[PDB]
Design an enzyme around this catalytic site. Structure first.
Site, PDB file in Angstrom:
ATOM      1  N   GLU A 198      -7.142   0.414  -4.730  1.00 35.57           N
ATOM      2  CA  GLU A 198      -7.140   0.393  -3.242  1.00 35.57           C
ATOM      3  C   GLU A 198      -8.460  -0.173  -2.714  1.00 35.57           C
ATOM      4  O   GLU A 198      -8.442  -1.066  -1.865  1.00 35.57           O
ATOM      5  CB  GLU A 198      -6.820   1.791  -2.709  1.00 35.57           C
ATOM      6  CG  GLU A 198      -5.336   2.118  -2.795  1.00 35.57           C
ATOM      7  CD  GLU A 198      -4.966   3.588  -2.689  1.00 35.57           C
ATOM      8  OE1 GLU A 198      -5.795   4.376  -2.183  1.00 35.57           O
ATOM      9  OE2 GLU A 198      -3.838   3.938  -3.108  1.00 35.57           O
ATOM     10  N   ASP A 257       0.877  -1.199   0.000  1.00 31.95           N
ATOM     11  CA  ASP A 257       0.000   0.000   0.000  1.00 31.95           C
ATOM     12  C   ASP A 257       0.904   1.236   0.000  1.00 31.95           C
ATOM     13  O   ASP A 257       1.516   1.524   1.048  1.00 31.95           O
ATOM     14  CB  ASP A 257      -0.958  -0.017   1.195  1.00 31.95           C
ATOM     15  CG  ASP A 257      -1.803   1.237   1.349  1.00 31.95           C
ATOM     16  OD1 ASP A 257      -1.913   2.003   0.374  1.00 31.95           O
ATOM     17  OD2 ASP A 257      -2.349   1.432   2.444  1.00 31.95           O
ATOM     18  N   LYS A 262       2.578  11.575  -4.047  1.00 30.52           N
ATOM     19  CA  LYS A 262       1.409  10.880  -4.657  1.00 30.52           C
ATOM     20  C   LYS A 262       0.416  11.898  -5.238  1.00 30.52           C
ATOM     21  O   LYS A 262      -0.326  11.520  -6.161  1.00 30.52           O
ATOM     22  CB  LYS A 262       0.727   9.976  -3.626  1.00 30.52           C
ATOM     23  CG  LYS A 262      -0.340   9.048  -4.189  1.00 30.52           C
ATOM     24  CD  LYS A 262      -0.786   7.975  -3.216  1.00 30.52           C
ATOM     25  CE  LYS A 262      -1.867   7.075  -3.774  1.00 30.52           C
ATOM     26  NZ  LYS A 262      -2.256   6.025  -2.802  1.00 30.52           N
TER      27      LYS A 262
END
Length: 493
Positions: free
Chosen positions: A167, A6, A64
């Site tokens: 996700e 993750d 990100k």
């Protein structure tokens, strides 16, 4: 062996499937999540984040937000306003300029590569082997450019990114929602450190589809921390008269205490904030109640419902149409959040059991195992079988099976038959193919006779009928008078 990573906006997590169970791996510091932060030496994780207060200009985070985007992206132009480090265009791409007094220019995927290197270096220590393969997760709203940029960050870090997975899909796999029967409407409620994502998933017989997405790019757990930090700085000023805001170390130590206190308030109704040398050698120790924490943040909490209503009405669904609610992110531990979500869905309890900040990494590791050669149980050998049922006609036109459907070839199978009349001198062997109990409903392949049966009462003579299939699919049917040795055969093609 291949790991699940993750790669989050604010924190990253790594897991692996070993000995029939997923293991979320703690880092050198013993933390199961690592800040997505990079800072004379180069620091990665908790160390880099601890430097932010004193050296913001050269501490890199929220890479990100920039990865796989163009400079003129309105999202990029908005985000660079509140980032303390220098972002400059180069060939229409955003680049990060920091002071190592060496100056260097980094692409967002290079900062992400450093973060992934640390997560790779966390798993290798635990396992005692080099990690070369990974499943890496991205938000459901990521385009091909953002997915490819994330792939490249893995490549630079020395990982073969086998798959890139959404996700919300990874979260659903962690709770095993892929291993149920029928169609299910699943809402994923993901409240991370810095970002809020709501995703409406459809699963119809193992197949995931992302119907709609919404949320808030600038709402997360750290916003709840800020509100509490404001409160205790104001209260300390009132209690004393010392303004602490400009003391790098005082704010640093207060943030650490508020984070830990907030987490304690997810289990208990009171938590103590104890700072040993808060400002100019003075201690500071106060109680924060759950009630006070909820009062400070209630409007932020209530704001998380608005994006949930938008995904429902954008996907033409009502609250009733939702089957499962899955909670992702550390902030979903907050009892008031869970209470608001349940209230919103008229008494429906969200799914829990997996630590909500480890759920995406957990699901990634499950898919990692599904593509891992280390999980080898046992090997298969192909069998040559007969696709048809073969047999002979018995008294009354009945189908008597000698070779059932899916019998392995080559084969030899024998059955004993006798006369249906006293001193019956002959038999007709009628070879049939088909599944029906009466031979009139089956397909005739041919016939032959066996003559010269010595006299005897009915059922006393003993004839062996043998069915032989060799490799070519050549059927050979033999009838033998076991008493005499009398024989006749037919070969069918």
């Amino acid at each position: 062996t291949v790991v699940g990573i993750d790669l989050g906006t604010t924190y990253s997590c790594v897991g692996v499937f070993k000995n029939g169970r997923v293991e979320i791996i703690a880092n050198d510091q013993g933390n199961r999540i690592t800040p997505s932060y990079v800072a004379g030496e180069r620091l990665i994780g908790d160390a880099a984040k601890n430097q932010l207060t004193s050296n913001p200009e050269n501490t890199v985070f929220d890479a990100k937000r920039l990865i796989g985007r163009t400079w003129n992206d309105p999202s990029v132009q908005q985000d660079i306003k509140f980032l303390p480090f220098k972002v400059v265009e180069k060939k229409t791409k955003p680049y990060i300029q920091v002071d190592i007094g060496q100056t260097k220019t980094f692409a967002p995927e290079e900062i992400s590569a450093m973060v992934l290197t640390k997560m790779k270096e966390t798993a290798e220590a635990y396992l005692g082997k080099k990690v070369t393969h990974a499943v890496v997760t991205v938000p459901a709203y990521f385009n091909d450019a953002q997915r490819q940029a994330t792939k490249d960050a893995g490549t630079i870090a020395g990982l073969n990114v086998m798959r890139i997975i959404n996700e919300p899909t990874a979260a659903a796999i962690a709770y095993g929602l892929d291993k149920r029967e029928g169609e299910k409407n699943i809402l994923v409620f993901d409240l991370g450190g810095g970002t809020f994502d709501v995703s409406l998933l459809t699963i119809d017989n193992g197949v995931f589809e992302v119907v709609a997405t919404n949320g808030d790019t600038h709402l997360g757990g750290e916003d709840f921390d800020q509100r509490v930090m404001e409160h205790f700085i104001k209260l300390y000023k009132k209690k004393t008269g010392k303004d602490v805001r400009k003391d790098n170390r005082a704010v640093q130590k207060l943030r650490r205490e508020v984070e830990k206190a907030k987490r304690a308030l997810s289990s208990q109704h009171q938590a103590r904030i104890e700072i040993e040398s808060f400002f100019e050698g003075e201690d500071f120790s106060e109680t924060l109640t759950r009630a006070k924490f909820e009062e400070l943040n209630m409007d932020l909490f209530r704001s998380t419902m608005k994006p949930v209503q938008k995904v429902l009405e954008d996907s033409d669904l009502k609250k009733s149409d939702i089957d499962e609610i899955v909670l992702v992110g550390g902030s979903t531990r907050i009892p008031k959040i869970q209470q608001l979500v349940k209230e919103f869905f008229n008494g429906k309890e969200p799914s829990r059991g997996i630590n909500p900040d480890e759920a995406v990494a957990y699901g990634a590791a499950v898919q990692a195992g599904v593509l891992s050669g280390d999980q080898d149980t046992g090997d298969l050998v192909l069998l040559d079988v007969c696709p048809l049922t073969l047999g002979i006609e018995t008294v009354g036109g009945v189908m008597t099976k000698l070779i059932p459907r899916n019998t392995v070839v080559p084969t030899k199978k024998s059955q004993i038959f006798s006369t249906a009349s006293d001193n019956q001198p002959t038999f007709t062997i009628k070879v049939y193919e088909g599944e029906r109990p009466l031979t009139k409903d089956n397909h005739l392949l041919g016939t032959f006779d066996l003559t010269g049966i010595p006299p005897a009462p009915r059922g006393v003579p003993q004839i062996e009928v043998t069915f032989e299939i060799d490799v070519n699919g050549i059927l050979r049917v033999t009838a033998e008078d076991k008493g005499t040795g009398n024989k006749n055969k037919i070969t069918i093609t």
